[PDB]
Amino acid sequence: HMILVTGSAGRVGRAVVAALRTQGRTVRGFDLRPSGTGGEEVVGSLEDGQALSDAIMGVSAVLHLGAFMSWAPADRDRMFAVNVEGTRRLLDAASAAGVRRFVFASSGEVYPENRPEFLPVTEDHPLCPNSPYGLTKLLGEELVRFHQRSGAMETVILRFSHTQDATELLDEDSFFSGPRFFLRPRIHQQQNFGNAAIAELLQSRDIGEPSHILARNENGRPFRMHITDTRDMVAGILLALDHPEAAGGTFNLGADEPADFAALLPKIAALTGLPIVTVDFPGDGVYYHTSNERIRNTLGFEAEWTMDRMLEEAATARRQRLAKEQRR
Amino acid sequence: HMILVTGSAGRVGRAVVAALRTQGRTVRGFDLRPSGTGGEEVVGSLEDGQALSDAIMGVSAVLHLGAFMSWAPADRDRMFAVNVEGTRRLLDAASAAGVRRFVFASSGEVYPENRPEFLPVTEDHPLCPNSPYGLTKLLGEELVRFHQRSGAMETVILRFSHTQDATELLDEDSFFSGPRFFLRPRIHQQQNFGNAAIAELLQSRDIGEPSHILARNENGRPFRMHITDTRDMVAGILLALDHPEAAGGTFNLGADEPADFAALLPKIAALTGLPIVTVDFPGDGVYYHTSNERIRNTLGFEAEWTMDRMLEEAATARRQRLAKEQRR
Ligand SMILES: NC(=O)c1ccc[n+]([C@@H]2O[C@H](COP(=O)([O-])OP(=O)(O)OC[C@H]3O[C@@H](n4cnc5c(N)ncnc54)[C@H](O)[C@@H]3O)[C@@H](O)[C@H]2O)c1
Ligand SMILES: NC(=O)c1ccc[n+]([C@@H]2O[C@H](COP(=O)([O-])OP(=O)(O)OC[C@H]3O[C@@H](n4cnc5c(N)ncnc54)[C@H](O)[C@@H]3O)[C@@H](O)[C@H]2O)c1
Ligand SMILES: [Cl-]
Ligand SMILES: [Cl-]
Ligand SMILES: [Cl-]
């Protein structure tokens, strides 16, 4: 019963592989780069037919978390090659090899949570992505649905919440949470994204010392979104892998409730000591609630990493980091 | 107002092109082979980025009919490359070029009509394709829907009925109508597919001379399906190109009612003189009605080619071939 995990060197993938191996289960990784764990893994690409064949031999179940997420147009062809065509051929290879279950990591971008038609967003919400990435995940879901209806291989679609390791939340250098909660990282981010008007706007709000940012829309409505701990995502993925009721299912996977930035930022500020700069962005901004009621009542999923628990652990890590910079 | 028509060397595409040029409109073809009309056309592939950019230059509207339809596993990669990736890059090229309207040829296999969940099949029927070709067209519609919601380009999705030139209906050597209505081209077909238990069964039913076949299901339910004249499809396509109310629309495009083979076959044999063999295939067979009410009500579509009109022309053509052949 070997389990194949693609994206096994990534945030969610590596934690899934570690949980499985801690259970003593046989796992094979599949990622562009080594995990650094020395465990069995393919180093290679989802675009490579040879790698796909090597990866699937003797495999009983597949956790397909490997995907490319990019903003720039120059990366769009690659994103479709990896996310759509890579997923298509991985499905066909899995099916032909007699894989028993295939779990697919999708995204809230298939709805999209950035522009919902109603709240809370349920699995029955229309799938109308507005980003090329979200489009790739929708096409991916459609490939999965085809195998679901047509073969012996069981499938599960899991639409991921935005996911962070707790320690990422209070790290200015983290890819997502830095720009999300800290003003200067966001300036650098937007500069690199080439969003000139935004980067100079943010610049205009800098107060002479590092600060947090409380993001709001043009009407002063604070951003609101789900941020789920990697450990809760791992728990849901293992449920999708093992629970009998997950077969043929599609589930939102994430924490119960979103974080409202008007309540989150002062909690973050209380742990960092940094002041808060409030910025009203042009547009309607971000504001969503996503229901995980289906996965809770079907698979018995229970998220346990509340923002408070996550923040408590993020803060401890930040303080240990400082004490090295500080040498205190 | 240059109109690009992909698949312009094909059954529907060449007829659409001929109609547009008969109206004195400016058209550019795009297909793997020359049409043989001597009109302006790209001879090239949808897989070729260079062909795409050449084809799209100065184009104000695109009628995207070019696609690869195959059953064989060896052809599957190219069918996805042409139908999905070709469509993705054509849409992007068209949007970037300022194309005003993009019309996409989809298929009743997106439902699929070969396995409906309710009759008559309407545009709101769920999209659950069970063939890889059907899946390519569904992925194709999702690409189009992405552009519809996004940019300035108008889109129209047309789900095509099975479509024939009238003259193909009584031609043993036509790709679809030969095997549909003639026993021996069908044996020859089912063999080449590789369905021995089907071919063997048909070969056991040969009465010693060429014959028509009347296909029925296991309970003796004769097949029933829409078969639309290319000319009716062309009329629908021109409406989708021109009618203001087509923008953002999705329409079933086909004749009003399906043909019941128990009625159709005697009419066919009354024109050919050949006997009929009634064959009961294993399975639920083919049985569907598809509604064209939306396109009739919304765009004013009226189909004009009844089966009897189609057959009269098919029979005339058959007699002309037989006459040249036997030199009479
Ligand atoms: N991180 C999030 O908040 C989030 C949100 C929505 C969806 N998702 C999806 O959940 C999955 C896992 O997310 P993550 O947080 O661990 O992101 P991640 O970037 O940390 O991990 C993705 C991994 O996939 C690998 N990969 C990329 N291209 C590959 C290729 N051609 N062949 C083999 N491997 C390749 C990457 O190397 C990477 O290790 C992804 O599919 C992601 O798109 C994540
Ligand atoms: N004929 C039917 O009953 C039917 C039913 C459902 C859907 N459709 C669809 O309606 C459209 C028109 O079909 P048709 O009846 O004219 O069939 P057709 O086979 O006669 O025409 C298809 C044309 O697309 C062209 N094509 C294939 N690959 C190409 C490529 N890589 N680059 C450029 N051109 C390429 C082909 O050369 C061909 O001429 C097609 O999209 C088809 O898939 C047809
Ligand atoms: Cl944000
Ligand atoms: Cl190319
Ligand atoms: Cl048939």
Side-chain angles (χ1 to χ4, degrees):
Chain A
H1 298 358
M2 180 173 42
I3 300 158
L4 175 69
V5 183
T6 68
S8 45
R11 176 191 292 98
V12 179
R14 85 170 82 88
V16 168
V17 166
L20 290 171
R21 299 192 161 140
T22 295
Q23 280 167 41
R25 303 174 79 167
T26 306
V27 185
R28 169 179 301 149
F30 187 175
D31 204 306
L32 288 173
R33 63 192 192 285
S35 61
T37 59
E40 180 185 9
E41 60 194 20
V42 154
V43 183
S45 170
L46 285 156
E47 303 190 50
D48 181 347
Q50 171 72 70
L52 292 177
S53 238
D54 281 17
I56 220 73
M57 297 178 52
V59 160
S60 180
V62 170
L63 306 180
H64 181 36
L65 319 178
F68 182 44
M69 182 204 285
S70 186
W71 286 263
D75 284 332
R76 183 183 301 160
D77 285 353
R78 160 83 66 233
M79 189 166 56
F80 277 83
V82 175
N83 296 9
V84 182
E85 181 72 353
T87 294
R88 180 179 77 81
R89 297 208 289 173
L90 179 64
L91 283 160
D92 278 347
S95 181
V99 166
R100 288 179 68 73
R101 186 173 291 188
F102 191 105
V103 175
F104 176 59
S106 190
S107 167
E109 296 257 30
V110 300
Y111 295 114
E113 294 166 327
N114 76 53
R115 195 181 176 160
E117 294 197 37
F118 61 84
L119 302 171
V121 183
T122 61
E123 288 83 354
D124 292 325
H125 187 290
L127 310 176
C128 293
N130 56 8
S131 75
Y133 167 85
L135 175 62
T136 70
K137 286 306 195 173
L138 174 59
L139 299 182
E141 289 199 9
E142 290 297 347
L143 292 165
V144 175
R145 282 190 272 280
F146 178 86
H147 286 263
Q148 197 291 310
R149 299 183 299 263
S150 73
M153 186 174 70
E154 301 176 338
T155 70
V156 190
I157 290 174
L158 296 176
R159 298 175 177 145
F160 283 14
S161 169
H162 173 59
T163 300
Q164 295 287 269
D165 296 336
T167 62
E168 280 179 290
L169 297 179
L170 303 184
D171 188 349
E172 292 91 334
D173 299 319
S174 75
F175 189 94
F176 289 102
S177 287
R180 204 179 301 286
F181 306 127
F182 299 81
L183 185 63
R184 295 175 178 189
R186 203 183 189 108
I187 295 167
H188 184 74
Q189 175 197 65
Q190 290 299 292
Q191 285 189 332
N192 299 343
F193 286 171
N195 296 341
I198 294 297
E200 64 175 41
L201 168 66
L202 295 167
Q203 263 174 25
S204 85
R205 301 299 313 274
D206 188 89
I207 60 178
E209 50 160 329
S211 64
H212 283 304
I213 179 170
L214 199 165
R216 313 198 304 183
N217 70 9
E218 66 185 18
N219 296 319
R221 183 186 62 186
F223 281 16
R224 178 179 307 194
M225 66 182 296
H226 288 255
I227 302 164
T228 306
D229 194 289
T230 304
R231 285 163 294 194
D232 275 331
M233 300 299 285
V234 166
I237 293 161
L238 297 193
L239 274 180
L241 173 61
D242 299 320
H243 200 287
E245 304 307 314
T250 296
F251 303 101
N252 290 328
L253 175 49
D256 294 355
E257 310 205 307
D260 183 279
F261 287 15
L264 171 60
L265 270 301
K267 285 175 181 287
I268 285 174
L271 293 163
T272 70
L274 293 178
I276 299 161
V277 172
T278 299
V279 179
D280 292 356
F281 292 92
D284 307 322
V286 173
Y287 190 88
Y288 63 96
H289 286 241
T290 293
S291 173
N292 63 357
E293 173 82 356
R294 187 186 283 182
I295 201 182
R296 286 175 48 86
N297 298 335
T298 304
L299 307 187
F301 171 71
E302 223 193 73
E304 62 169 279
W305 292 91
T306 59
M307 190 50 70
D308 289 352
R309 282 189 82 199
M310 292 173 67
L311 288 175
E312 180 200 296
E313 187 180 321
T316 298
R318 172 181 187 82
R319 291 190 311 268
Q320 304 262 350
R321 287 199 301 273
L322 297 187
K324 188 184 201 162
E325 276 174 350
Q326 293 177 352
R327 231 193 299 172
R328 308 249 167 244
Chain B
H1 293 95
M2 186 170 296
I3 300 157
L4 176 65
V5 183
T6 73
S8 46
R11 172 188 291 104
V12 181
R14 77 190 171 244
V16 163
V17 173
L20 288 170
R21 299 195 165 133
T22 293
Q23 292 180 0
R25 301 173 82 161
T26 308
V27 190
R28 172 179 298 154
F30 186 177
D31 208 309
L32 302 163
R33 308 167 311 281
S35 66
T37 65
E40 188 187 341
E41 57 193 25
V42 166
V43 179
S45 179
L46 289 156
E47 298 196 57
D48 175 5
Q50 183 67 54
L52 295 179
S53 270
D54 291 353
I56 213 73
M57 190 61 68
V59 169
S60 64
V62 179
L63 305 177
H64 182 27
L65 314 193
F68 183 30
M69 188 196 294
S70 178
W71 303 257
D75 289 333
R76 191 183 296 165
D77 287 354
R78 181 129 68 171
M79 180 165 70
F80 277 79
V82 170
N83 296 5
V84 185
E85 180 77 356
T87 295
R88 186 182 72 81
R89 298 210 297 168
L90 180 61
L91 281 162
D92 277 343
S95 186
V99 164
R100 307 164 206 214
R101 184 172 291 187
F102 187 108
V103 176
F104 179 57
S106 191
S107 169
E109 304 224 26
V110 297
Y111 296 114
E113 300 168 323
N114 74 17
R115 191 189 177 131
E117 291 187 28
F118 59 82
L119 299 175
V121 184
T122 62
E123 291 85 349
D124 301 314
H125 185 290
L127 311 170
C128 299
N130 59 11
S131 68
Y133 165 84
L135 178 56
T136 69
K137 287 295 191 183
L138 173 57
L139 300 180
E141 290 187 15
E142 284 304 343
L143 295 172
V144 177
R145 280 193 273 281
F146 181 85
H147 284 271
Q148 174 60 47
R149 292 189 297 273
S150 162
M153 191 169 68
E154 298 171 355
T155 65
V156 184
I157 293 172
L158 302 177
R159 302 179 175 144
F160 280 16
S161 160
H162 178 58
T163 296
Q164 294 288 268
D165 291 338
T167 59
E168 292 178 276
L169 295 177
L170 304 185
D171 188 346
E172 283 89 337
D173 298 326
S174 67
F175 186 90
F176 293 104
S177 288
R180 207 177 305 291
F181 306 129
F182 298 83
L183 185 52
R184 293 166 172 196
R186 197 189 199 98
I187 302 172
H188 177 94
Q189 182 195 65
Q190 289 302 283
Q191 283 179 348
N192 270 34
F193 279 5
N195 299 34
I198 289 304
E200 293 182 351
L201 169 78
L202 299 165
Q203 183 62 76
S204 78
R205 294 303 301 279
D206 191 84
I207 59 173
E209 65 170 319
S211 74
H212 289 296
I213 181 181
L214 200 159
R216 317 200 301 191
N217 82 343
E218 66 189 7
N219 309 331
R221 191 188 54 188
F223 285 8
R224 176 178 299 202
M225 59 179 301
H226 287 259
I227 301 183
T228 309
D229 192 285
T230 301
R231 290 163 291 195
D232 276 333
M233 299 302 288
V234 166
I237 290 170
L238 295 195
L239 290 174
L241 171 59
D242 287 332
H243 203 296
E245 295 306 296
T250 302
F251 308 92
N252 294 331
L253 173 58
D256 294 354
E257 304 277 341
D260 189 292
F261 286 11
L264 177 55
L265 263 300
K267 290 165 116 156
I268 283 178
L271 292 168
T272 75
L274 300 183
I276 303 166
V277 182
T278 297
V279 172
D280 296 13
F281 291 91
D284 290 342
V286 174
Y287 193 92
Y288 64 92
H289 294 239
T290 299
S291 175
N292 65 357
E293 195 201 37
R294 184 184 291 180
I295 201 176
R296 288 184 17 246
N297 290 342
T298 303
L299 308 188
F301 178 66
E302 294 188 58
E304 180 205 320
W305 289 96
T306 63
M307 188 52 75
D308 294 354
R309 281 187 83 196
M310 296 177 69
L311 287 176
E312 167 172 356
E313 226 183 288
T316 293
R318 174 179 182 89
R319 295 196 301 277
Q320 312 321 132
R321 291 195 301 278
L322 291 166
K324 177 214 70 132
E325 161 169 19
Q326 67 202 13
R327 204 170 159 72
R328 294 292 186 193

mmCIF file of all heavy atoms in Angstrom, chain B residues 196-210:
data_model
loop_
_atom_site.group_PDB
_atom_site.id
_atom_site.type_symbol
_atom_site.label_atom_id
_atom_site.label_comp_id
_atom_site.label_asym_id
_atom_site.label_seq_id
_atom_site.Cartn_x
_atom_site.Cartn_y
_atom_site.Cartn_z
ATOM 1 N N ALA B 196 -14.888 -6.898 -30.882
ATOM 2 C CA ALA B 196 -15.103 -8.196 -31.502
ATOM 3 C C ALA B 196 -16.502 -8.727 -31.237
ATOM 4 O O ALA B 196 -17.226 -9.081 -32.167
ATOM 5 C CB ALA B 196 -14.056 -9.184 -31.002
ATOM 6 N N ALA B 197 -16.879 -8.772 -29.963
ATOM 7 C CA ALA B 197 -18.204 -9.246 -29.557
ATOM 8 C C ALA B 197 -19.360 -8.464 -30.200
ATOM 9 O O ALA B 197 -20.500 -8.933 -30.211
ATOM 10 C CB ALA B 197 -18.326 -9.240 -28.038
ATOM 11 N N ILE B 198 -19.070 -7.276 -30.725
ATOM 12 C CA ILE B 198 -20.059 -6.513 -31.480
ATOM 13 C C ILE B 198 -19.970 -6.840 -32.980
ATOM 14 O O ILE B 198 -20.977 -7.148 -33.627
ATOM 15 C CB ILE B 198 -19.896 -4.989 -31.256
ATOM 16 C CG1 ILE B 198 -20.341 -4.594 -29.843
ATOM 17 C CG2 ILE B 198 -20.696 -4.212 -32.288
ATOM 18 C CD1 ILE B 198 -21.769 -5.006 -29.513
ATOM 19 N N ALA B 199 -18.757 -6.779 -33.520
ATOM 20 C CA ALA B 199 -18.513 -7.063 -34.933
ATOM 21 C C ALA B 199 -18.937 -8.476 -35.301
ATOM 22 O O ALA B 199 -19.623 -8.690 -36.305
ATOM 23 C CB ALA B 199 -17.049 -6.863 -35.255
ATOM 24 N N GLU B 200 -18.507 -9.440 -34.494
ATOM 25 C CA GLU B 200 -18.894 -10.832 -34.691
ATOM 26 C C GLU B 200 -20.414 -10.987 -34.749
ATOM 27 O O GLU B 200 -20.944 -11.696 -35.606
ATOM 28 C CB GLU B 200 -18.309 -11.717 -33.582
ATOM 29 C CG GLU B 200 -16.789 -11.829 -33.607
ATOM 30 C CD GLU B 200 -16.251 -12.752 -32.528
ATOM 31 O OE1 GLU B 200 -17.040 -13.178 -31.658
ATOM 32 O OE2 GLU B 200 -15.040 -13.054 -32.553
ATOM 33 N N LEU B 201 -21.107 -10.314 -33.836
ATOM 34 C CA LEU B 201 -22.567 -10.342 -33.790
ATOM 35 C C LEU B 201 -23.197 -9.797 -35.077
ATOM 36 O O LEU B 201 -24.167 -10.359 -35.587
ATOM 37 C CB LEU B 201 -23.065 -9.544 -32.582
ATOM 38 C CG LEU B 201 -24.566 -9.260 -32.521
ATOM 39 C CD1 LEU B 201 -25.344 -10.479 -32.049
ATOM 40 C CD2 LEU B 201 -24.843 -8.063 -31.632
ATOM 41 N N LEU B 202 -22.647 -8.699 -35.592
ATOM 42 C CA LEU B 202 -23.147 -8.088 -36.824
ATOM 43 C C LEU B 202 -22.858 -8.978 -38.035
ATOM 44 O O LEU B 202 -23.709 -9.156 -38.916
ATOM 45 C CB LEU B 202 -22.513 -6.710 -37.028
ATOM 46 C CG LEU B 202 -22.767 -5.640 -35.965
ATOM 47 C CD1 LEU B 202 -21.798 -4.479 -36.130
ATOM 48 C CD2 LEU B 202 -24.196 -5.138 -36.043
ATOM 49 N N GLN B 203 -21.648 -9.533 -38.066
ATOM 50 C CA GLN B 203 -21.209 -10.402 -39.153
ATOM 51 C C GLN B 203 -22.078 -11.659 -39.208
ATOM 52 O O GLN B 203 -22.198 -12.297 -40.257
ATOM 53 C CB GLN B 203 -19.731 -10.767 -38.960
ATOM 54 C CG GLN B 203 -19.119 -11.612 -40.074
ATOM 55 C CD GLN B 203 -19.131 -10.916 -41.428
ATOM 56 O OE1 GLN B 203 -18.326 -10.018 -41.687
ATOM 57 N NE2 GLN B 203 -20.042 -11.335 -42.304
ATOM 58 N N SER B 204 -22.696 -11.999 -38.079
ATOM 59 C CA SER B 204 -23.573 -13.166 -37.990
ATOM 60 C C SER B 204 -24.963 -12.838 -38.516
ATOM 61 O O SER B 204 -25.807 -13.722 -38.673
ATOM 62 C CB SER B 204 -23.691 -13.643 -36.539
ATOM 63 O OG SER B 204 -24.583 -12.820 -35.802
ATOM 64 N N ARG B 205 -25.196 -11.559 -38.783
ATOM 65 C CA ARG B 205 -26.523 -11.092 -39.159
ATOM 66 C C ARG B 205 -26.598 -10.710 -40.625
ATOM 67 O O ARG B 205 -27.671 -10.377 -41.134
ATOM 68 C CB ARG B 205 -26.923 -9.907 -38.283
ATOM 69 C CG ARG B 205 -27.093 -10.295 -36.836
ATOM 70 C CD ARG B 205 -28.115 -11.406 -36.736
ATOM 71 N NE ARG B 205 -29.395 -10.977 -37.294
ATOM 72 C CZ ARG B 205 -30.282 -10.244 -36.629
ATOM 73 N NH1 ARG B 205 -30.025 -9.864 -35.384
ATOM 74 N NH2 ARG B 205 -31.427 -9.888 -37.204
ATOM 75 N N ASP B 206 -25.450 -10.750 -41.295
ATOM 76 C CA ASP B 206 -25.386 -10.492 -42.725
ATOM 77 C C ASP B 206 -26.253 -11.508 -43.457
ATOM 78 O O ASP B 206 -26.095 -12.714 -43.265
ATOM 79 C CB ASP B 206 -23.936 -10.579 -43.207
ATOM 80 C CG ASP B 206 -23.763 -10.071 -44.623
ATOM 81 O OD1 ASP B 206 -23.624 -8.839 -44.795
ATOM 82 O OD2 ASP B 206 -23.769 -10.901 -45.557
ATOM 83 N N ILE B 207 -27.176 -11.021 -44.281
ATOM 84 C CA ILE B 207 -28.132 -11.900 -44.954
ATOM 85 C C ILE B 207 -27.659 -12.356 -46.332
ATOM 86 O O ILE B 207 -28.432 -12.949 -47.090
ATOM 87 C CB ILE B 207 -29.543 -11.259 -45.065
ATOM 88 C CG1 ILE B 207 -29.488 -9.944 -45.851
ATOM 89 C CG2 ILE B 207 -30.148 -11.046 -43.677
ATOM 90 C CD1 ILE B 207 -30.856 -9.338 -46.152
ATOM 91 N N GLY B 208 -26.397 -12.082 -46.659
ATOM 92 C CA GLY B 208 -25.816 -12.567 -47.903
ATOM 93 C C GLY B 208 -25.744 -11.549 -49.030
ATOM 94 O O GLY B 208 -25.225 -11.842 -50.114
ATOM 95 N N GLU B 209 -26.278 -10.356 -48.777
ATOM 96 C CA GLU B 209 -26.216 -9.252 -49.724
ATOM 97 C C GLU B 209 -26.188 -7.957 -48.914
ATOM 98 O O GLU B 209 -26.555 -7.961 -47.735
ATOM 99 C CB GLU B 209 -27.425 -9.272 -50.668
ATOM 100 C CG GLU B 209 -28.766 -9.033 -49.985
ATOM 101 C CD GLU B 209 -29.902 -8.823 -50.975
ATOM 102 O OE1 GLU B 209 -29.688 -8.125 -51.991
ATOM 103 O OE2 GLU B 209 -31.011 -9.350 -50.734
ATOM 104 N N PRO B 210 -25.727 -6.852 -49.524
ATOM 105 C CA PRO B 210 -25.690 -5.592 -48.776
ATOM 106 C C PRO B 210 -27.052 -5.227 -48.194
ATOM 107 O O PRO B 210 -28.066 -5.411 -48.860
ATOM 108 C CB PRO B 210 -25.270 -4.580 -49.840
ATOM 109 C CG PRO B 210 -24.407 -5.370 -50.767
ATOM 110 C CD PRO B 210 -25.059 -6.733 -50.834
#
